[PDB]
Amino acid sequence: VNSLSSPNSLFTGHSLEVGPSYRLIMQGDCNFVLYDSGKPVWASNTGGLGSGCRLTLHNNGNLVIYDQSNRVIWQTKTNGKEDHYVLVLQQDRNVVIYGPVVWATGSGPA
Amino acid sequence: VNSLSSPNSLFTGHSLEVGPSYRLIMQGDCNFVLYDSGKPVWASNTGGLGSGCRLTLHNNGNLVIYDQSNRVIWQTKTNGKEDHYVLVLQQDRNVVIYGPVVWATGSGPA
Ligand SMILES: OC[C@H]1O[C@H](O[C@@H]2[C@H](O)[C@@H](O)O[C@H](CO)[C@H]2O)[C@@H](O)[C@@H](O)[C@@H]1O
Ligand SMILES: OC[C@H]1O[C@H](O[C@@H]2[C@H](O)[C@@H](O)O[C@H](CO)[C@H]2O)[C@@H](O)[C@@H](O)[C@@H]1O
Structure with missing residues (x-):
């Protein structure tokens, strides 16, 4: 997988990959x-x-890294409208946060 | 890969996949x-x-299917601001278009 959708997290040792x-x-x-x-x-x-x-x-577009103590150690400080966003490792090697939602099939969550 | 970033295309026989x-x-x-x-x-x-x-x-958020004759046969009609967007097949099975750009590392295109 090469994407992370809000409000989910990428946990320790896990990666996004584009072979x-x-x-x-x-x-x-x-x-x-x-x-x-x-x-x-x-x-x-x-x-x-x-x-x-x-x-x-986060569902407002802010990307953050929390430590074991559940504290903020790094963030993009991109606090926008409450909706849904996605972080993507692209084939062109750029890493980008996109949002809010423009359209959806509604085939999920399932 | 489970994403398609504007203004790119998914060609015949190709897929986005989330194992x-x-x-x-x-x-x-x-x-x-x-x-x-x-x-x-x-x-x-x-x-x-x-x-x-x-x-x-498209870079304005519109998703379209073109036939061999280069004609439009289906589209979401989501014409928004000129920027960049992404289409994502998520692990929760939803298929979503997100945009515009909120933040980027700038590690690409490379
Ligand atoms: O609409 C895109 C959005 O769909 C799913 O999120 C859900 C929707 O926002 C809507 O159904 O409200 C739900 C909460 O009541 C919410 O979970 C997810 O697939 C999300 O990632 C996607 O952006
Ligand atoms: O900024 C996110 C964006 O970066 C790359 O697109 C480029 C930028 O918009 C900027 O450098 O202008 C370029 C055209 O002059 C444009 O290609 C891509 O990685 C794009 O997918 C990403 O959203």
Whole structure:
């Protein structure tokens, strides 16, 4: 999967991936990093600032990293209209937050 | 991959997938269908209306299916602000168009 929809989280050790070289991972050392064939090309630069951290995209568009103590250690500060948003690791290697909802099939949640 | 970012297209026979059971495919018979473990649960209902068809998400948020003759055979008619949008097959099985851009790492296009 290469997307994370609000208000869900990407937990410790989990990643968004776009084969065969792109991996955006919420690391166990709290750093949120994008690797291109093993080389880090973007990151929140929060390594060592915690453990058991998670990445959460909120229903207002704000992206945040919480540590084990459930505290904020990094955020995009993009507080907009209450709706639904999505974070996407794209095939062009860009990582983007899109929203609000424009249209939906309604085939889910199911 | 389970997303399509504007202004790109999903060409004939190609799909967005969220393992292990969700498959959203632009079929060779021009129908755009979402299958859950082989069972169709949503579709544009455009089968038989063309061949060599493609699904395109525009930079204004409109989602369209063009036939081989490059004509419109189905669309969401969601014409909004000029920016960038994304179509996503979610793990909760919903298919959603999100936009405009809220934030981006700028790690792409690369
Ligand atoms: O509409 C797109 C939206 O659908 C699902 O969210 C639900 C809808 O917003 C609506 O049915 O209200 C529900 C809460 O009562 C809400 O969960 C999800 O698939 C969501 O991700 C999607 O953006
Ligand atoms: O900003 C998010 C956006 O980035 C990339 O699109 C580019 C930007 O809009 C900006 O750099 O202008 C470019 C055209 O001059 C445009 O391509 C893509 O990654 C896009 O999908 C993403 O939404």
